[PDB]
């Protein structure tokens, strides 16, 4: 029966490939060959954030587009005021091996996680003046790679045990476990309607999930190496990847295949962090060769280089109003660009 | 600037002062990473300096504080989190001398020695550990002494053609670990043989990290 099941799986894969190639009638490069190029977008370091003592591994913006959280291997979780270069908080962590951080949309909680296999939720708004651990979520066998907040009570996590999980912070228990990835799941991104999320893993695949149903809807296999970064389009009907094969790729959920590849022959390094702008025209990808690059999303042409970091940039994000990009690197420096 | 913004700047300065004094307190600590196979005597070493994830072992010896880190609970891909340990002072590698035949849990692998050399190739020639020194513990030497007479060393390596005494075979094993890094000028490999009853291994780690600290200070003074 194993041979019959393998033949059925190969037949279904051939059917999926034929249905994907049937919809392919015109590439995105052909249809956007008439739109005007964006130009020569040049940004400058408006602010630099100092105070970290080790490599910064993750950062996340706030909904207010002013507050910034950061995580580093010195066991610190600093909440920054980006406008005035001020330190609102400095949260010591029980485990210094942090790999991810998140900031709640309401601004009341932050999260962190890493090699301690625990997502820790920290309460910022307390009657006492300190920041305390509201909940320690345990249940992942592998290293926690990404965490993102849906609301004040739900947080979705990606881990190194080839599973993604959705938690309930008040109960501190699993709600839905997402299974189907073969390799280590590395990055998460959440749709603006907070009902779907895409996870990129080390099996060179990205899977689209349903939060309320807990099933994988679509699987996107175009890469050749470990996917490290992921982000939706602002529309929610597309997303962009980033892997160690020096290639960013854009996928559409409705077209169910790849639309545009972002690679130059002079770039041989991994990609750590990928983000979009507010309009989605301007794709930003952070690389391992100590600088960020700016890509035009509708036509794969490099329109800028953000070069201000001594070591490799590991995390970057764009504010919700689109007024600033904050790149974080391994030289313990956060820089805000405009 | 407002009064509240001035007080926020003062709060930020207090936070900076606390971070700086925490750095001053933690500058004297030495971070170490312990790596090894399954039954390689990792438990006999952690007991000798003193889904879970990391295990941190803390111990002190003569005005130095050490923080060993065990990554044996992480069964995922090692290449996706080994960059966290790029700034460690040393790597303690534990390999068993009693691995003449010693097939693995798979029960078709050749030797535990070959897996140990494969892990040594993965660690010493890694991209993030180009200049990080290694402390190499060749433990379970009692079983090695009671096992060299019964079984010759040719059952593991079919190139020995030498006497099966304790000293010569142990030196052959140690030298086959040592001639395996192609960065012999920058990093150094310190070797020891542990009988699981010795009480001087902590002194060996202390001496090795003193060597590494002095060599790093000499290097970033530009002396070499």
């Amino acid at each position, epitope marked *: 029966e194993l041979d019959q099941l393998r033949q059925e799986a190969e037949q279904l894969k051939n059917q999926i490939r034929d249905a994907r190639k049937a919809c392919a009638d015109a590439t995105l490069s052909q249809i956007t060959n008439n739109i005007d190029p964006v130009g020569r977008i040049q940004m400058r370091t408006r602010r630099t954030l100092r105070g970290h003592l080790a490599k910064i591994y993750a950062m996340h913006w706030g909904t207010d587009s002013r507050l910034l959280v950061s995580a580093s291997q010195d066991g610190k979780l600093i909440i920054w005021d980006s406008y005035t270069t001020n330190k609102v908080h400095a949260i010591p962590l029980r485990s210094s091996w942090v790999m991810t951080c998140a900031y709640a949309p309401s601004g009341n909680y932050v999260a962190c996680g890493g090699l301690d296999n625990i997502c820790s939720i920290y309460n910022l708004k307390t009657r006492e003046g300190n920041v305390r651990v509201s909940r320690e979520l345990a249940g992942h066998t592998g290293y926690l790679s990404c965490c993102r907040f849906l609301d004040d009570n739900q947080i979705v996590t990606s881990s190194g045990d080839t599973t993604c999980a959705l938690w309930d912070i008040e109960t501190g228990q699993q709600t839905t476990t997402f299974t189907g990835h073969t390799g280590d799941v590395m990055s998460l991104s959440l749709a603006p309607d907070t009902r779907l999320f895409v996870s990129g893993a080390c099996d060179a695949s990205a899977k689209l999930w349903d939060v309320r149903e807990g099933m994988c809807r679509q699987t996107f296999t175009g890469h050749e190496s470990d996917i490290n970064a992921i982000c939706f389009f602002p529309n929610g009907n597309a997303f962009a990847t980033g892997s160690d094969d020096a290639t960013c790729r854009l996928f559409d959920l409705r077209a169910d295949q790849e639309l545009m590849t972002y690679s130059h022959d002079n770039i041989i390094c991994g990609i750590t962090s990928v983000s979009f702008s507010k309009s989605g025209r301007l794709l930003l990808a952070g690389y391992d060769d100590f600088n960020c690059n700016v890509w035009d999303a509708l036509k794969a042409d490099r329109a800028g280089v953000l070069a201000g970091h001594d070591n490799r940039v590991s995390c970057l994000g764009v504010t919700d109003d689109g007024m600033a990009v904050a790149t974080g690197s391994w030289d313990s420096f956060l820089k805000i660009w405009n | 600037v407002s009064a*509240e913004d001035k007080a926020a700047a003062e709060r930020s300065k*207090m936070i900076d002062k606390n971070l700086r004094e925490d750095a001053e307190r933690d500058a004297r600590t030495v971070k170490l990473l312990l790596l090894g196979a399954g039954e390689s005597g990792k438990a006999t070493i952690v007991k000798q300096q003193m889904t879970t994830g990391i295990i941190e072992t803390q111990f002190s010896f003569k005005d130095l504080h050490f923080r060993m880190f065990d990554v044996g609970a992480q069964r995922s891909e090692r290449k996706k989190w080994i960059h966290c340990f790029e700034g460690v002072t040393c790597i303690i590698f534990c390999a068993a001398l009693s691995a003449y035949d010693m097939v693995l849990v798979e029960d078709e692998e050749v030797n535990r020695m070959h897996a140990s050399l494969k892990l040594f190739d993965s660690i010493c020639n890694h991209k993030y550990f180009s200049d990080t020194s290694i402390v190499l513990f060749l433990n379970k030497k009692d079983i090695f002494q009671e096992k060299v007479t019964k079984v010759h060393l040719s059952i593991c390596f079919p190139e020995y053609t030498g006497p099966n005494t304790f000293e010569d075979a142990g030196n052959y094993i140690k030298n086959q670990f040592l001639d395996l890094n192609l960065k012999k000028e920058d990093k150094e490999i310190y070797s020891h043989m542990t009988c699981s009853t010795d009480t001087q291994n902590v002194k060996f780690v202390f001496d090795a990290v003193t060597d590494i600290i002095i060599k790093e200070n000499l290097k970033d003074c530009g002396l070499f």
Partner: single-chain antibody
Amino acid sequence: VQLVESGGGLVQPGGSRKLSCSASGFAFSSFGMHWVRQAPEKGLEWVAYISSGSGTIYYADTVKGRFTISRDDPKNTLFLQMTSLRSEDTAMYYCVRSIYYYGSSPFDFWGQGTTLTVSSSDIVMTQATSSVPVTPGESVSISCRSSKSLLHSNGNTYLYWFLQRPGQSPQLLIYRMSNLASGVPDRFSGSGSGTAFTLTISRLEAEDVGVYYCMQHLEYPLTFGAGTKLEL
């Protein structure tokens, strides 16, 4: 959160007295502390302020030189050393905690206070209304005015609203304009622009009867205003 003050009593003129406040239930080392006076037939007056780390000390013009404010962070105690007491220092002295970061809520908690008795420019905040009659279930607007425009260049208007219930310590309602404090029911609202200010109560109850005080935090020495009273 508890802030209990100690001291008080009948002090002769020209003498000395020390007021000590004990803080329990919060991180005392991360809070800047204040002292606020209240004469028996007058309003609220600001005395002194000590910051976290004791790096910034401020005094009012009336009590400069005579008064010294200090803290002991391991003992969780706040002190106010008073020398050469006149008959204008007869007041109940409140200890107020204040924390300052982006989005913080200064003047959030107020102590019970100790009564002191002695025998024998500045931004003027004006509240022209005083003792207006109220009826439960109605809407009451309390107006506030300032000599200097409190809207800073960063877009923050530093106008603070307080409620003094009869026989009780003051409580914070609105810290910056249209910023409701924690625990305040969501019927109080604040609005204004520059000089003019308003405080609107949607459907007032018997617990909203009291004296409502203005305060500015644009610059020291933190002038209050003569409060407006609500009476049934």
